[model samples]
Target chain A: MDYCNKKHTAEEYVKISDNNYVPFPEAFSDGGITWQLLHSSPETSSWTAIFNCPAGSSFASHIHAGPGEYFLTKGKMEVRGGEQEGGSTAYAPSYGFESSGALHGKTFFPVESQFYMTFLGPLNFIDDNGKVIASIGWAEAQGAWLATK
Target chain B: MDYCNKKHTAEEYVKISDNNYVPFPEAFSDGGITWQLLHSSPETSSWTAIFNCPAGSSFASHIHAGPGEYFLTKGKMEVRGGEQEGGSTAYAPSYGFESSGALHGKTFFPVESQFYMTFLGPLNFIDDNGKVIASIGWAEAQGAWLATK
Candidate 1:
């Protein structure tokens, strides 16, 4: 099990984007997502991201090596597993184990969806290079984390 | 010193509001301040609120029993006690302390601001009985666990 006792503020994270980072490749077609790394300790790292799932669009399933949490700010998301189903608020303590690794979940936004996602700790993707890939900074970097089961 | 340590979920907290059994009070107010209690644990509680100060408004001094933490989500805030000037980002684990029963010193916000606030355990307030007391009902009434701080 992992431990998380740190607090992250929104101000610090927003600065990471003041430098003008590129969007992840997966977000090319969609309006895309933006993220700012807020705080990172040996135990965890927190990020704030704005996710916009276009109407009739679904995010591919993936997993993270560590824990992840999300707070929905706008619109609605249809996610499987955890406390959210159909259209409701969902909080995933660990996205990796919850998705069961198949990482093939479906998300639909009847309109549009936006939320803040915090990856509790460093994530090592099972993919080659063991990179922490994401929709933010995917063009220049491997991405810090992923969502999986 | 008081002690508290516990964890809570948004789901568990929203339920508390529905019951409306806890003694709720205006934690803070300004020209157009709005606040909502999100959740409270043994050692900490979270709130969502916005503070709007006019062009030249100056807030009065205040104090807290333990510590106060804020995350600016919108606009800007001017802190009087810090060396950092305005427009600086505040990261998590960042906090301001108040001695047992002393004033927290003078602080001011030059413009409208919004953020999530988390306060340390045990609320100290004047009850309708005209008595100053500490209670954990804010958590217990919600059917949540209490842990040592």
Candidate 2:
């Protein structure tokens, strides 16, 4: 933990992150999703990323440990059960805020989609029986990103 | 505070936040800066905002209590002392990650600038003698936004 013990806080930047994306694990997503980790901060346990979801891509059911803010840059995504089922349907160029403990059945993309999201904490992917498949955090995200390099 | 105790997490969206700007206090900034608060998450002690800074405007000296991520959507901004002094000078359409405990000395704008930023914790505005002028956080930011409304 930083705990503000030092003067510098590891400020950084990436001019372009187009080439760094890696394949998301098939265990967590369907339809071949790709993602790029943009940044991670230990001080806040926060991580930022951009995800590319294909026409039929969908994430596994999970719960947010903390809040998340997302910007959908392209295509469409149905959160939870979508509007027809009283969930959410976000079109391109939309911003969404998902609070702590938010649960989802499956996050689905209706078309080829791209989104940038910042997650404040880990996500706990779950099975149909509510068993935890994985707990993914900033450290895990960074570890995965580094594994590719 | 959330600690993920409940089933609901307060997911929300903003179709357009264009008409909800408020003037930033002059004590914290030199120029006429206007801002729109996008979101605040008490679960993570975080907040998000978009700022419009006029040319020659600058923010007061401060320390990031946690981490911050910013996207420069338009114009130019100089962080710390900028490149001449070993800091950073970000142009339009740039992204930067400032870590926890990062100290900034008069974040300056060289041209009409607009940026969106998310803060994980409070910003401690300090004086020349290191005395604190203010410690602004997500709650304070929300209060300011609500006050304007």
Candidate 3:
């Protein structure tokens, strides 16, 4: 499918503010995380989601099925074994690369961090045995996103 | 063109930092702007670019052909005719949308500002009379990006 062929009308700009975040699903939420969907494309399993993590919160580790990138817009986060600082950005191209996934290491928010994340495909929340426990796809994620708004 | 089918390898993760920004082209650099390319998809004419604008700098107004989004990472900008503060994010789904393009107002940097921008298609830099002065496509923009690096 040519997802790129989708063209919006000139008047259809979508802007969501930080104060407009919706609660994430309990399955993906650690109680301190909220999110807002910016865009999504099921054809490519691609989507952009903004995450707000309060201080002292953390994300569980997971494995990505495809490329992912995150940009820290506010606050700080500590990723294990990698660049642990905030006010920066990170990217993970494919599987076996676990930098951005919380599964690689517990991602901790020292001071309430908010970041924009883009995923090119699904992410598999795995168990310690490296087995996929749950998978989050763009379509399902978008469904949750729409429910929030 | 099914740009989604273009899967990048594990080694293709590109991480750029603030300390590593390169000078934008003379044409695009209205004197105080620097940029770095995050990703580019020629098939979709889509790409992500980071821009750093110093204080007193401004971006000319332009029109977008498709969707565009911007996340402010740092500093402050005065977007024409609106709450022109920084440390926020914005999105423009299409033309007549004021968030991404300066068409609504010339974006001015009150303090050094940095933001992440994604354009789903091409942008047409225009003159006050609404005539296309120059058009920038993903390929040409990528070329400038590659040259900077």
Candidate 4:
């Protein structure tokens, strides 16, 4: 009942996903960080949010099938081969060739930051271990609720 | 560019829409306040984060349709009928008839706060001009969002 002035620090948000697979701090190169499983549909295969990003860091490349969208919650974001100095959102609806898998070429954060993202498709990947092995970190790899076909 | 370690006051996260039909200061008879967009597609409708409940305010009863979910960013929230309390990352999905737009119930917020929300399906009820009217505010109508289908 601590009304009117309740505050939750970053530690609290991070603590919520204690049991999930958390990438090492080293995995988050350039000071980037990731957090997930804010809400999961027990009856359905769905995840509410997945927060990830780099602190002036860059990634290899990757691809995704279906629609994906995200919103900026903190700092600046630059998409290497896609858009210039992107701020918050990154969305694509088609799961085609060009959108298939490619190197982001070069991306940077310029500043420290984080973003709230959502992927509307089955979390697809080339790796068989359910582990994100690709060095690339783009719309497809940010995080997704993969469809179970 | 101002990435320096500058302190920022806990200011409100305000997103304004050009649509005048949108309301402001939306009240929740529940412990807090909830506001949403009227004319946008349910698939892409974005709702304003909830406002912290005034010192000691509570809302009455209301009904919802389709699927509704919210992320509590700041403050506390309590879903009355079910005795549910939400802390930092509280989200409540539809529960059969409870979210089938048949039961109009109330939620109460006993503190100041904000939340990120999203809903599925279109809200019923339209104005005289065949427009859907939504309201906000505690006492008087603070603001509103109006959309015509």
Candidate 5:
């Protein structure tokens, strides 16, 4: 049904399942990681997704060009600059700051960790020398990951 | 520390606590409900919050002037027009259509339920006749509730 005046938007819903999980794009894939994009808004540079990282997986250091938030749903992951223990309904209220070039450290999944993440802007993956190697925005990330299917 | 270029905005974080739960603004208080606003954007007419409804509590039918999405983080709530079972890490992927004025149904909390909700526009609380009684936007709702403290 036509729910809103927006031409390209409409009502939608989905339940997370094993079949829905797909490999996170190669650009963001550090190891055996999969993800499901729940929603995306290129206009606002915001998006939501469920990220799954198997045990021993690691996410390289990156810089959030805008605020990022997450909630741990399953398993555990050791955050570099913060502490996040799984097995509880704990959430990272908001990480880093908008336009903060600060280096938000990497994370290592001690166990198969599944979490919900929301990024308000692009994620700039940096090299060891602090040079931006790749930048992934909501639209680009969603497209790359969804194309894997 | 200054984390961003925005002057009015800064880095912030908060851990959820039972003692911190406060009544949802009077504008949306149809029953015994409490909430903690995680983030708010007056300019974008969007906001995020954790809503807590006591057992046996019921929320009246409302019209979503814009899109609304929610994730069940704790307990159980029976949605009249939607499928949502708590006690699991299940989320309503996305609800409503962008800019769509849709009649979203009511909800009944069978047990004490706590959930995360994000609204992209104003919620028009309507009467049995579908006449809007109170229009609650991010600014209006946050202002009324924050004033209570």
Candidate 6:
């Protein structure tokens, strides 16, 4: 009981119906997507969120420094060029396990889509030439959420 | 780029329709329950799974040694005494979070339900008198999954 037993600091819920959605910021996305920050765990270096993406909206290129677990709840999502390019085109109610070091391309939504995702480590945004654009971790995510407010 | 960065080790998808469910073992629940082990992250001491519970199925009393996060993808679930005692009765498409050290009562499914949960650390099951019946974590979860095959 004495070996690195850390307590989980936050215990709560963020029901999307409560209207916690806010713009997901233009720097990391295009076409004006929105998101809700659910929780963050410093102990595990993780954070959770739900994104509200409209048709034509999409995220930029990035690499999650750790595993990314997600549930495609609402509509279709095309990750890493999707099926046409041999990645994956996820339909609603699907589970996606995007492992670390997996470089992501444009995650596009052909229709209105919403999905919940849990992230760990810093997600490094990369440019067209593969330059690191930005690095977002749980703390940065919280800061962005606060900045939006 | 060299300070304790561990790469995530798995990349895959587990669509529910593929039907990987098997009985969830009676020692952990009452009524008929089934589950599908999605992924496990040993680096974070975490694992994820989806459970399918019939009406009246309930999980035993237990405490997740680390934080637990879940999505109630289907019917109603009453946890920790539920509404009568101010506990949450989660509806379908809801998000729930339980931090460390919270001892729980019956996590009951009032209707046919399905939920996805990610777990960290050992989940200690307790008896009526608070006796520790079992302490299961990611490895044990994998053991159970393999045993069922």
Candidate with top lDDT is 6
DockQ for the candidates, in order? 0.09, 0.47, 0.19, 0.06, 0.29, 0.49
Evaluated at residue B76, the lDDT of candidate 6 is 86
The model with the greater DockQ, 1 or 4, is 1
True contacts kept of each: 0.00, 0.65, 0.14, 0.01, 0.28, 0.57
lDDT of 2 by residue, B16-72 (tens): 355776799777889889988888878668888879899999988999998789877
- lDDT tens digits, residue span B1-149, model 5: 87756554444444555666787654444678887766676656676677788877766667777666666656765553445332122243322122346565566676777777677888888887888888878887778657876
- Which docking category, incorrect, acceptable, medium or high, applies to candidate 2? acceptable
Which candidate wins on TM-score?
A: 6
State residue B144's C-alpha deviation in candidate 2, in Å: 2.2
lDDT per residue as tens, model 6, A26-124? 888999799888888876788998888999999989988888899887889888788899888888868888988877879899999888899878899
Better candidate number, 3 or 4, judged by DockQ: 3
Consecutive 10-residue window with the lowest summed lDDT within model 1 chain A: A92-101
Q: Kindly indicate the candidate among 1 and 4 with the higher TM-score.
A: 4
Order of models, best TM-score first: 6, 2, 5, 3, 4, 1
Q: Compose the digit string of candidate 2's lDDT tens values, residues A127-149.
A: 99998889999999888888874
Write candidate 4's Cα lDDT for A108-133 as tens digits: 56655554443434333334333556
lDDT per residue, candidate 3, B1-149, as tens digits?
65555333332234555666887766644657888777776645667777888877777666776556666656765554344343222332111122234353366677777767777777787787988887887887887777777
Cα distance off (Å), candidate 5, residue A54: 5.5
Worst 10 residues of 5 chain A by lDDT: A87-96
Give lDDT tens digits, candidate 1, residues A1-149: 78967543222223323343334335323345443433333222323343445555555444443333444545555554324543233331111112112232444455555444434333333333433344332222224433310
Query: Which prediction has more favorable lDDT, 4 or 5?
Result: 5
Error of 6 at A68 (Å): 1.3
Candidate 1's residue-wise lDDT over B1-149, tens digit each?
A: 67776442222213212232222232322343433444444333422222334433333344344433344545554554434643343332122222223332334445554444444443344444535543433463133221210
lDDT, candidate 6, B1-149, per-residue tens: 67786544756766655367899989889999999888877767889988899999998899878888998878988876786777778888688888888677788998999988888888999999988889999999999999997
- Docking quality band of candidate 1, CAPRI definitions: incorrect
The complex in candidate 4 yields a DockQ of: 0.06
